[PDB]
Copies of this chain bind each other. A is one copy, B any other.
Amino acid sequence: STGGYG
């Protein structure tokens, strides 16, 4: 998986 905020 790539990136994301939290």
Contacts of A4 in B (CB 8 A): 1-6
Name the prevailing secondary structure of the A interface residues.
loop
Contacts of A6 in B (CB 8 A): 3-6
In the complex, 16 of the A-B residue pairs with CB atoms within 8 angstroms, ordered by the A residue number, are A1-B1, A1-B2, A1-B3, A1-B4, A2-B2, A2-B3, A2-B4, A3-B3, A3-B4, A3-B6, A4-B4, A4-B5, A4-B6, A5-B5, A5-B6, A6-B6
Residues of A that sit less than 8 Å from B by CB: 1-6
- Other than the given A1-B1, A3-B4, A3-B6, 6 more pairs (CB < 8 A) read A2-B2, A2-B3, A2-B4, A3-B3, A4-B4, A6-B6
